Amino acid sequence: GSSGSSGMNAAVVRRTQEALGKVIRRPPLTEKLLSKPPFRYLHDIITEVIRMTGFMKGLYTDAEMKSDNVKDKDAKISFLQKAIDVVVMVSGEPLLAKPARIVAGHEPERTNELLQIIGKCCLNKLSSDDAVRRVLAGEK
Numbered sequence: 001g002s003s004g005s006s007g008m009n010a011a012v013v014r015r016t017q018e019a020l021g022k023v024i025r026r027p028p029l030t031e032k033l034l035s036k037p038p039f040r041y042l043h044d045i046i047t048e049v050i051r052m053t054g055f056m057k058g059l060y061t062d063a064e065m066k067s068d069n070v071k072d073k074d075a076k077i078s079f080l081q082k083a084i085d086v087v088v089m090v091s092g093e094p095l096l097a098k099p100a101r102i103v104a105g106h107e108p109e110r111t112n113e114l115l116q117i118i119g120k121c122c123l124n125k126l127s128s129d130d131a132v133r134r135v136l137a138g139e140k
Contacts (some may be wrong), residue, residue, distance in 0.1 A: 006014040008035055017113040020118035024048040034112060039076050043067045045115065046083055053122040055088050059132045066117040076103045082135055084114065089131035091117045 008029070017029040027033065027044055047065055050054050059082055063069045070079055080099030088095055095117070097110030121128070 012109055012112040016115045017117040017120075019123075020045055023119045023122050024052050035108045036105055036113060037102070038105070039077060041101065042080075042111075042115075043070075046118075049118060049122060054127065055090075055118070055122045056083060056128050056132055057091070059083060059086055059128070059136070060074060073100075073103070083118075085135035086128050086131040087114065087118050087121065090126055090128050091122045093117055 013031050013034045016034055017031075021029050024045060024050070027041060033041055036135075046061070048081055050057050050060070050065075060079075064079060075097040080103065084097075084099060085097060087125075095110070095114060097107055097114055101107040102111045102114075120126075
């Protein structure tokens with residue numbers, strides 16, 4: 001009758017639907033796609049932001065920008081890391097979600113946050129110039 005103790009809640013989702021709902025229009029933010037967002041799905045959003053607001057414009061190159069190029073796993077993760085880094089530097093909030101899980105389809109609860117954070121940055125007209133490079137060079 002009373003089962004749970006999982007994590008992925010409806011709240012963490014309602015936050016993303018609005019977080020990205022504004023910054024970007026497509027793809028459509030659905031409780032489903034928001035919980036089972038494929039490496040590809042997210043890719044669209046990430047890029048969209050750079051085309052919508054511009055945030056992290058110098059983060060990805062012509063190659064990276066094109067998901068097609070990305071095929072190997074090791075890459076999928078390395079691609080997400082770039083953003084995950086900046087987003088954190090800009091927003092200023094430590095994230096746990098790993099790019100090795102979301103890419104597969106796990107630890108969705110957290111994934112939602114990652115998107116919520118990014119949206120905020122743009123919402124507050126917060127651009128990224130230093131962070132972008134920092135991660136690019138691999139600073140710490």
